[PDB]
């Protein structure tokens, strides 16, 4: 895995990224895409059509004379928009995400320089890995002599590792507190200048207590007109368009899926009959005939739709025990969100409402007790997923440590591991397998967050990211560590005795570092570079437009871009931060790769937040408190592991120092928490009065009951 | 320590309590005390003077013909006032304290019956304590064969212990949740009917941010008139009047002191000259001469006392960055206490104010940063006190395990521990020594709570009780356990080998139980019975009245009773609950003694809450959340210790069951918490509006700015 495998992976990966960048140039210079690659410039009313208004080309005939402007330009230009002109083109959230990448860089760049110098020198001048291969059968290479494991048991050269660790934790923590403050100040300034949104005045009251002679709405009016007497303006109840909406949706699906097999070439048409109960399928069946999904799955749907409408809207059997109450001021609404209203701690429970567009309406109609049982069931499913994944994870770790599995088992083999280009290619293949598994993980975890019952689309994402973190941690990190350890040094474990289990464990942790390096390379580099091409979103449009088009004009738009994830992306940045801290005080060579990822990523994503991407909710940066927490967790795990390894190499004249480390970390956490979290979780009342008195001097007229009344209704 | 020592202690203690009760009868039938023994009947305007209006006797001449009405009566009668006529004679707090004693009884009575039956039988039919004295030198008696230690290693009779443990934890937890609800409902109903107090409308704002052109009061008016615009009525600033307060104090001391040395017999008088720098003293010195602290001292103090009044009432150098703001409604004030006011999380910080009489004004004039450093310094002092106490604690535990210290050291000895009445008397003496040390502890801990900076006299008490708990736990319990263990089985530890350290530890835990029994007896029984006599408060009055009297009439009153403590008392109840749980699943014989304490105590204290005692603040039961927590802690420690002992006797076919136990305990804690703590820590807004709308219909006129303006001023 020495320089050979690292170089092969690196060559292949840099090549993949350059090929990507070339195909992207090509595809972004053809004027039939355009609305796929420059969509927030069109969805902001600022770009018109193909060739500056369209009607023209720029396609393939000469297409492109050679260019070094095949890259670079996108690069520098993404770099040049001030960061305050980006808060208003894009939003605060996007800007705070790019900030995460830059904090990474900060921390790590300094740590890397230092590490390298001090520690590589120390570790390299020191002999104890050649002696264990010759007297204890521990397999190793020459990339392993810049690690904490070429160092003899018996210190005096372990103190470097401890001092460096201290330096590193202090730097990380300082940098992290400075970012907390910036992000807080920014949030507050944004919040003070954003224009009316309907949720700066509304709350969601959940658990209105039942009665037998008053409706839900005659009980919500009477409570707030007696208890919040001067500022109360209106309310809107919660009902079940769950079924009504399901039918409107089936109708849309039928019409799409059949105005297709309707204007196929015009005229009378064909047939199909897929088995329809799970997914995919086609022609395996009996539902022949034709057009409009027999225009009549078309019209039966429409009739059920009208009847459902009726029942719902006329029945107080479909009103849920909850409402959305609005007030005349933003000061009054912030007092109903942070105050207790009744003596029963579970009834009448106010919070702040989300913006009417970050509401997942399908879970506003789920009872409250169910909420608790559901949460439990989902925690159980999580534990089981964690176990099945351990299975696929070791499968991967057996392809990566194959040259040691083929020593205590000189059996099947890649022609007995000769033909050495093949084994480096095996390091690359291990990477690709883990990639695959982890894709479907993101989607499953979102489905499990939408069951436990949340009702904002921004909290479902935050939850999903937290769960990915846990999964990632355990599984990837530790599973890989454990299994890889097993295999190579399994060879060594058989032909020795059960004490050497520990020492062998220490050295194997540093080798798993080397595998992590390769994975970073694949994932990081190539993925950030292949994200620039938007390929599912490009096929998707072109198929769409030469199939289900029949556009009235061009007003029929199906370009919709997407949004950063929060989910996928944050989970990745965090895995890489963990890796980095841990390996900084052990193998100081994962750092250069971590850094290339952070920089490319910042450049690609600024481009995609500026040209493509559009945000679907605005919660001025709350995930910050969450991100900070996850970095503090990494720091603690790192520190505990260094203690462990230092114990395995018998150095007791240094581990209490490592203990002070952990305590200093938790103390800084607590400080930060205090100050800045207050900023992110509680709306001051002086801030709500200043926004409110400056808008009643500018718009001295304003009727708020027009605007706020119907903003929280549904598909009605 | 068998039946012999237990019986001697019990006889002597029951005798002491009966002698006490007799002397109390005597002293409560003489009509010169009366105002010492029936003071809340005089301080409520309901009793007049000595013999029904006084002027008469009932003293010593025939004094008392023999009576069996020498006791009993106080007993039944304390029992007969409904518990709702006691909420208004006395207050809610006192009633909730007596409830603690009754919960004790509940839990333990059931647990005791069960224990006894099942476990004593099981443990007694079983041989393994006679075999270890004959083959491992473990000293023991015959009271030890009803303990978990006459049971052979190897279970099948340890399962009883585990089942019983489960039963016991469930019962405790059920009982505890039912009390939570009662106490919560009671608090809420009280709070809804109590008449105006000035703090139902006021808050304390601490940390008003400095300026260079506006005073503290022109900055508190402007903030609340712009930010809480409609309900704001008044404010009163905080000034350091620590020095004037101190000189008024020195003046009263001088006059009292020496209007005494003045009317000694009238005329020209004597002299004195104590060393005056630390305390006590008399005649060792030079300050001779004459009457009322050389009346010139009394006037030089009244010079400073009028020129301190000027440099304090007109300066703005003695105004502290804080105020007390009042509002026109109780709904408005509860919104300022539970809401954030500014973006700087450390400035402008509102809470609810205490009643103007539960304010410790001396610490309202301490800066805020100091508050944090002070807290740290006091935590350090706590750790050191804990260590010195370990020293006196083992001294005590060496007098209690003397018959085993005099085996591996047949030396000095009580005439070689013969004369056996003497060694039982040593069990009683150990008890008395611990009593002594622990007295001065209560007072020290209060002094340390008044340094860390609190400003209510009710929180200083709560803090002091929590600290006593920790001290008690560690020191008493564990120190005693450890040291006692050491001594007896030290004998056994020398003449064996360092593996038998563990097994010997198990058996010694059960013997320390027996010593705890004796301490309970002394402390509990005799102390509750000697508390009925109020002897420092009786001497104190009689000296006072035949010395510093010269009463204008009788209006000069110096009877002041006191108040329950909260401090001392709660700390005791909790030590006994701990002991009980722990020993219930091990030595099932501490329980009968625990119970006698709980019952006597309830009877004596009801008497003293009904006749003597008067409350100095009213915080309708908040210490409840605190008490509950401490009982949950006991449950957890108990459970962990049973696991330990069961491990020491090699029973692995039962300890995971013990683990489930701990988790079930924390779950019930969390439920309770949720519901009822909300009740005790947050004032609902529907409750404040109902109190406010029913008082504006009864007293339709009411000016609140008269009443609320000057309630928060000082010695001015
Ligand atoms: C993630 C870690 C969390 C907390 C970290 C502390 C846990 C680890 C601390 C100790 C780890 C290893 C402890 C250690 O001491 O290992 C046991 C060694 O002493 C065993 O040495 P041996 O080679 O068996 O010595 C005997 C050799 N003959 C066999 C005596 C030659
Ligand atoms: C407060 C407790 C917190 C948690 C509770 C768990 C901690 C205690 C759990 C184990 C306690 C004792 C554990 C135990 O296993 O003791 C060690 C014994 O196995 C020693 O047995 P020995 O008599 O040394 O056996 C060897 C005998 N020769 C010497 C082999 C005869």
Author numbering:
A (entry chain A), B (entry chain B): 2 to 717
Quoted from the paper:
Then we solved the AtOSCA1.1 channel structure in the lipid nanodisc environment at 2.5 Å resolution. The 2.5 Å resolution map allowed us to build the model of nearly full-length AtOSCA1.1. We used the parallelogram of the midpoint of the transmembrane segments of AtOSCA1.1 to represent the central cavity area, specifically the Cα atoms of the F384 and I660 residues. This illustrated that the area of the central cavity was extended. We found a strong lipid density on the extracellular side of the central cavity and a lyso-lipid-like molecule fitted this density well. The putative lyso-lipids seem to insert into the central cavity and extend the central cavity like a rivet docking in the huge lipid storage cavity, thus resulting in the extension of the lipid storage cavity and allosterically regulating M6 resulting in channel activation, which is consistent with our previous electrophysiological finding that lyso-lipids promote OSCA channel activation. As the putative lyso-lipid in the central cavity may regulate the channel activity, we refer to it as a ‘modulating’ lipid. The mutation of H651A (a putative lyso-lipid coordinating residue) right shifts the pressure response curve indicative of a channel less sensitive to mechanical force. The addition of calcium at the dimeric interface of TMEM16A is reminiscent of the putative lyso-lipid in the central cavity of the dimeric AtOSCA1.1 channel.
